[PDB]
Scaffold this motif. Structure first.
Motif, mmCIF file in Angstrom:
data_model
loop_
_atom_site.group_PDB
_atom_site.id
_atom_site.type_symbol
_atom_site.label_atom_id
_atom_site.label_comp_id
_atom_site.label_asym_id
_atom_site.label_seq_id
_atom_site.Cartn_x
_atom_site.Cartn_y
_atom_site.Cartn_z
ATOM 1 N N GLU A 132 -17.713 17.487 10.951
ATOM 2 C CA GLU A 132 -16.594 16.621 10.607
ATOM 3 C C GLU A 132 -15.358 17.454 10.291
ATOM 4 O O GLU A 132 -15.443 18.502 9.647
ATOM 5 N N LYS A 133 -14.204 16.979 10.748
ATOM 6 C CA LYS A 133 -12.953 17.701 10.578
ATOM 7 C C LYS A 133 -12.240 17.259 9.302
ATOM 8 O O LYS A 133 -12.587 16.254 8.678
ATOM 9 N N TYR A 134 -11.229 18.039 8.911
ATOM 10 C CA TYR A 134 -10.416 17.675 7.754
ATOM 11 C C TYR A 134 -9.716 16.344 7.979
ATOM 12 O O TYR A 134 -9.704 15.477 7.096
ATOM 13 N N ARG A 135 -9.102 16.177 9.152
ATOM 14 C CA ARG A 135 -8.481 14.926 9.573
ATOM 15 C C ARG A 135 -7.316 14.527 8.670
ATOM 16 O O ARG A 135 -6.721 13.462 8.857
ATOM 17 N N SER A 136 -6.976 15.372 7.700
ATOM 18 C CA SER A 136 -5.869 15.093 6.797
ATOM 19 C C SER A 136 -5.402 16.399 6.172
ATOM 20 O O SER A 136 -6.162 17.365 6.061
ATOM 21 N N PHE A 137 -4.133 16.412 5.763
ATOM 22 C CA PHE A 137 -3.546 17.598 5.153
ATOM 23 C C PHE A 137 -3.979 17.781 3.703
ATOM 24 O O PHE A 137 -4.104 18.920 3.238
ATOM 25 N N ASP A 138 -4.204 16.683 2.978
ATOM 26 C CA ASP A 138 -4.548 16.786 1.563
ATOM 27 C C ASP A 138 -5.905 17.448 1.360
ATOM 28 O O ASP A 138 -6.070 18.269 0.449
ATOM 29 N N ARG A 139 -6.894 17.097 2.184
ATOM 30 C CA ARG A 139 -8.206 17.723 2.064
ATOM 31 C C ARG A 139 -8.125 19.218 2.341
ATOM 32 O O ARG A 139 -8.748 20.024 1.637
ATOM 33 N N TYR A 140 -7.364 19.607 3.367
ATOM 34 C CA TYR A 140 -7.202 21.026 3.658
ATOM 35 C C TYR A 140 -6.505 21.743 2.513
ATOM 36 O O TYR A 140 -6.877 22.865 2.163
#
Ligand SMILES: [Mg+2]
Lengths: 354, 106, 44, 92, 144
Positions: free
Chosen positions: A23-31
């Motif tokens: 599964e990818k981060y798919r968002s900047f906040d998680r990264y």
């Protein structure tokens, strides 16, 4: 030539055979969250915190504070959960919450914090201000009991001293009112120091107030070891920090050695250090309360220096180092005409022998 | 044609070299190194020191700006747990901002 | 740097991607939903 | 000496003592120094012009709404915050 | 002739961490132009909005945290209906503003992402800070 890494690679654990299944981060906040969590971890390569972050001694910060009180977590949690249950059951509270118009009692929340989480926040704030570093030469203390100091201005106005706030020497001219919860049988000691007020020895500090053997909350009946002296931060010397310390005595203590004559207007006599003092008194003395505030220069400092201390007021100035210029060359190639003005010292014309 | 000369682009100040304010640290065609503390970057990706001190090189976490949509899209496609790392160059200031000294005794 | 042990720490494209039907799983499937109510069709 | 000097008007003396209170020593003497030039003549001229400027400024007493300095911006902000933090006694 | 009270060292040593910040002469950590957020400040305000709780921190640039205001704290839980709504954010903002006013800090910075900046809870937190007297703009460093 290749050299094996001295530690695990940052992305060695993550497999790549099923990266499409991963599964990818798919968002900047998680990264961003993962990035900061990783940055908060030690590494075997050179890092920013290695060069710029402060270094702490490996030994644990020694505590001198009052032992932590005990409490029943289960009962506390049960009462809190039933309170929040009734609060959420209250429809008016829920309607205010959904309309985003509810308000909380600031005085009530602060008063409850002063008993629940106040000591730890105050300890953290004192550590940030660096009091525990300068005095005690490195130690820790948790202000288990609260203290409140107010300076009386006018007939009604009070300037509080909560934590690291700004109070002018004009307001600090008179003796403040000190309040702290206590009961019969407890001996207290109040001390005031100026961390940066010293004018001769940078390592030493100036004592400004010392009361000993205070019976309970009766501050006036306490023995006045040294008369109160208002702070005198020199003009242009910056912002000084003045610290109140409340200690408790398990046994009565004689203060003959550290006693000061009344009045004590000599800086050499006012010179004092909490270090080696708490060392010689720690057997029968233990801190209970701590407070401090920031102070600037004002006009009252002039009067204090001229009359109270009977001296000429020193005035300081903040001066930056002179700018750097490279060694002057005989033939400055491709440099503007103003190259020589950088090395000229005086702008007045000169004529030499003529 | 194509008889161009080299652009002489690379590191100008290595590790542990003392620099002054405004000195060029490194020039580059693309962002091979990234500025850190008190290091500024020009239009041509030229790295200069904003404060006088010692140059250091570290490996640091790369968090691009939200408005940089290209890099945001690049980092949003990484598998969970992946973190990007890049080389950053910093300067550690050596002299204090100023000192307080007695100027008058009134 | 390549010689230094921290070589390759900056690589990122190996974490990024550069149909055949198996005998146990199906390659590509399509589910088509027909409805005279577009709202219900799109909701399902 | 400022107060003893009778060649200036008394209100002017008082206004000078108020505004230029940082240039008055323990003995009450007003002191002006100059290092702007290599010549004692020019330095003395600068000091005398400073005295004249102070005298005429006290005489005119401007009351214009002057601009606010960026250094004084944070000072007034912290003063307003300190005034807000000032407290009143319950019983008077 | 000499007076002991007037014996003053030629150079004054001030150990207050905040003296240079208050004089607006402390050097800020400029740079980091290729990454987010910038570190050119003295105090930073950070907001963490979790699934159940909301936290606000005021911390220094070197890493130390100055003050905190978290919804896990009982003195605000006992009066807060929900810890994950606009009311919770407003209460956190007001309480943190009061704590910072008492601690003496007045100026900070705020570096939000565009979406959380447009978020209604955060703008009400900004309003709470403004009404409490906290200014989210720091004075520029005095180089000369
Ligand atoms: Mg060629």
């Amino acid at each position: 030539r290749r050299t094996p890494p001295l530690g695990p690679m940052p992305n060695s654990d993550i497999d790549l055979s099923n990266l499409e299944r991963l599964e990818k981060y798919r968002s900047f906040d998680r990264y961003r969250r993962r990035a900061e969590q990783e940055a908060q971890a030690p590494h075997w390569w050179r890092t920013y915190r290695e060069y710029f972050g402060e270094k702490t001694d490996p030994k644990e910060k020694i505590d001198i504070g009052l032992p932590p009180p005990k409490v029943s977590r289960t009962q506390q949690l049960l009462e809190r959960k039933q309170a929040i249950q009734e609060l959420r059951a209250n429809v008016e509270e829920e309607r205010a919450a959904r309309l985003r118009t509810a308000s909380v009692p600031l005085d009530a929340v602060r008063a409850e914090w002063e008993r629940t989480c106040g000591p730890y926040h105050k300890q953290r704030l004192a550590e940030y201000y660096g009091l525990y570093r300068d005095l005690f030469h490195g130690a820790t203390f948790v202000p288990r009991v609260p203290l409140h100091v107010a300076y009386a201005v006018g007939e009604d106005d009070l300037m509080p001293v909560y934590c690291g706030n700004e109070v002018t020497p004009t307001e600090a001219a008179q003796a403040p009112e000190v309040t702290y919860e206590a009961e019969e049988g407890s001996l207290w000691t109040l001390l005031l120091t100026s961390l940066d007020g010293h004018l001769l020895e940078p390592d030493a500090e100036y004592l400004h107030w010392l009361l000993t053997n205070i019976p309970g909350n009766r501050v006036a009946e306490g023995q006045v070891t040294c008369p109160y002296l208002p702070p005198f931060p020199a003009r242009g010397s910056g912002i000084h920090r003045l610290a109140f310390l409340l200690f408790k005595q398990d046994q009565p203590i004689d203060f003959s050695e550290d006693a000061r004559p009344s009045p004590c207007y000599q800086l050499a006599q006012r010179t004092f250090r909490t270090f080696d003092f708490y060392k010689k008194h720690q057997e029968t003395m233990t801190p209970a309360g701590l407070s401090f505030f920031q102070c600037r220069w004002d006009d009252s400092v002039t009067y204090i220096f001229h009359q109270l201390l009977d001296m000429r007021e020193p005035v300081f100035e903040f001066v930056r180092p002179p700018p750097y210029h490279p060694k002057q060359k005989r033939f400055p190639h491709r440099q503007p005409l103003r190259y020589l003005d950088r090395y000229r010292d005086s702008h007045e014309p000169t004529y030499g022998i003529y | 044609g194509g008889k161009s000369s080299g652009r002489r682009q690379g590191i100008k100040k290595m590790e542990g070299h003392y620099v002054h304010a405004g000195n060029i640290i490194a020039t580059q065609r693309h962002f091979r190194w990234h500025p850190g503390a008190h290091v500024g970057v020009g239009k041509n990706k030229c790295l200069y020191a904003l404060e006088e001190g010692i140059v250091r090189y570290t490996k640091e976490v790369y968090v691009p700006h939200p408005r940089n949509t290209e890099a945001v899209d690049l980092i949003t496609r990484l598998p969970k747990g992946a973190v990007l790392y890049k080389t950053f160059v910093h300067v550690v200031p050596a002299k204090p901002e100023g000192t307080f000294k007695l100027v008058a005794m009134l | 740097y390549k010689t230094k042990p921290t070589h390759g720490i900056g690589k990122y494209k190996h974490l990024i991607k550069a149909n055949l039907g198996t005998d146990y799983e199906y390659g590509v499937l399509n589910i088509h939903l027909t409805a005279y109510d577009m709202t219900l069709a799109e909701s399902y | 000496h400022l107060a003893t000097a009778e060649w200036i008007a008394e209100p002017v003396r008082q206004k000078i003592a108020i505004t230029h209170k940082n240039k008055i020593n323990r003995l009450g003497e007003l002191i002006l120094t100059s290092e702007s030039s290599r010549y004692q003549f020019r330095n003395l001229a600068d000091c005398l012009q400073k005295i004249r400027d102070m005298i005429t400024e006290a005489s005119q007493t401007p009351k214009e709404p002057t601009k606010e300095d960026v250094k004084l911006h944070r000072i007034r902000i912290e003063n307003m915050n300190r005034e807000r933090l000032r407290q009143k006694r319950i019983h008077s | 002739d000499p007076v002991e009270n007037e014996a003053v060292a030629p150079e004054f040593t001030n150990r207050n961490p905040r003296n240079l910040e208050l004089l607006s002469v402390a050097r800020k950590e400029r740079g980091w132009r290729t990454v987010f957020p910038s570190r050119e400040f003295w105090h930073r305000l950070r907001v963490i909005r979790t699934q159940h709780h909301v936290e606000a921190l005021v911390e220094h640039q070197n890493g130390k945290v100055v003050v905190s205001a978290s919804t896990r704290e009982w003195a605000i839980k006992k009066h807060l209906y929900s810890t994950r709504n606009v009311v919770a954010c407003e209460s956190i903002g007001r309480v943190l503003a009061q704590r910072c006013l008492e601690a003496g800090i007045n100026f900070m910075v705020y570096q939000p992402t565009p979406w959380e900046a447009a978020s209604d809870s955060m703008k009400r937190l900004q309003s709470a800070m403004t009404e409490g007297g906290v200014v989210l703009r720091e004075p520029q460093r005095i180089y000369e």
